Amino acid sequence: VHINLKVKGQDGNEVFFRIKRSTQMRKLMNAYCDRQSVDMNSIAFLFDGRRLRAEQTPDELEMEEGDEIDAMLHQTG
Amino acid sequence: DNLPSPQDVADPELPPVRATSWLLDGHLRAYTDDLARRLRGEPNAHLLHFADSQVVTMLSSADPDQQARAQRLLAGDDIPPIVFLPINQPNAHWSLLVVDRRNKDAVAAYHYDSMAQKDPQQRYLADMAAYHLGLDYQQTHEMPIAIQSDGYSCGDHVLTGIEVLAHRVLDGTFDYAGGRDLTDIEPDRGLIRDRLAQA
């Protein structure tokens, strides 16, 4: 019912999350952004090259125990 | 239970594109996602792969696992042989690197930079991407592309170059005289905004 996930930001440090497989990603996105003090409109979340959205759940995304998510600062030019 | 509530912060949304606004990495991936949809089912279309600019930057990560993940997503056994890599210099510039792996023993790499007086940082960032993909950066060709006359449309030149080169792969002119030459492209910010709106 629960799943352990990791989020890795550009600081290299990994942050461990434990949520339900039915929990939408916005809960994880908000909790991560509060640690870095940057809003969700300044950071992109990718899972194996797929950009994550607030409403999607780990089951819909076919995530597994120990999967890792990349959190990247927005790029402009 | 997990639904967004009106009393909390709204979900994130990619901001719209203006007439002279700088393009974000989210705008580039939305464009190439829509391009892949438009090309799906056409002959030679499955030889192409449009990379997310954040995965390209992940190649140079100081973290071992994040670096290896980017290498698998762009050069794994299941990745098409012609890859388009957007090269970002943060708060500065966009350029485009193309890697043609159709011959495993004769890989060719092409770099397009629409800036008039070129920044040594930009080619260095392209060389780091090639290096972490297992290539010799010294063999990358600096190729001709139309020079931008403004200070905002470098993202437009990257997306237009991907657009044009992809269709040359489809019809088969990519491998012949001038097939990799982008001197005559004319980026259209209005067309780019329309494709992002109709996606």
Residue numbers in the entry:
A (entry chain B): 19 to 95
B (entry chain A): 317 to 515
What does the paper say about this structure?
To understand what structural adaptations enable XopD cross-reactivity, we determined the crystal structures of covalent XopD∼Ub (2.9 Å) and XopD∼tSUMO (2.1 Å) complexes. To our knowledge, XopD is the first cross-reactive Ub and (t)SUMO isopeptidase. Furthermore, the extended VR-1 conformation was completely different between the Ub- and tSUMO-bound complexes. While the Ub S1 site primarily consists of contacts to VR-1 and some to VR-2, tSUMO binding displays the opposite trend, with the majority of interactions taking place at VR-2. In contrast, the bulk of contacts made in the tSUMO-bound structure are through VR-2, which forms multiple ionic interactions (XopD Arg385 and Asp368 contacting tSUMO Glu86/Asp88 and Arg69, respectively) surrounding a hydrophobic interface (XopD Met374 contacting tSUMO Met90). The tSUMO A62R or R69E mutation both resulted in a decrease in tSUMO suicide probe reactivity. Surprisingly, a M90A mutation had much smaller effects, suggesting that the small hydrophobic interface may play a lesser role in tSUMO recognition than does the extensive charge complementarity. Although highly divergent in sequence, the Ub and tSUMO C termini threaded into the active site similarly, with no apparent favoritism following Ub Arg72. Additional mutations in VR-2 targeted the primary tSUMO interaction surface and resulted in either a slight loss (D368R) or a gain (R385E) in activity toward Ub substrates, while activity toward tSUMO was significantly reduced. Interestingly, our structural analysis of XopD bound to either tSUMO or Ub demonstrates that XopD’s flexibility in substrate recognition primarily arises from incorporation of an intrinsically disordered VR-1, which can be tailored to suit either binding event.
CE clan proteases, specific hydrolases for ubiquitin-like modifications (SUMO and NEDD8) in eukaryotes, reportedly serve as bacterial effector proteins with deSUMOylase, deubiquitinase, or, even, acetyltransferase activities. Here, we characterize bacterial CE protease activities, revealing K63-linkage-specific deubiquitinases in human pathogens, such as Salmonella, Escherichia, and Shigella, as well as ubiquitin/ubiquitin-like cross-reactive enzymes in Chlamydia, Rickettsia, and Xanthomonas. Five crystal structures, including ubiquitin/ubiquitin-like complexes, explain substrate specificities and redefine relationships across the CE clan. A comparison to the previously determined SENP2-SUMO2 and NEDP1∼NEDD8 complexes (Reverter and Lima, 2004, Reverter et al., 2005, Shen et al., 2005) revealed differences among bacterial CE DUBs in three variable regions (VRs) near the substrate binding (S1) site that were arranged around a structurally conserved helix (constant region, CR).
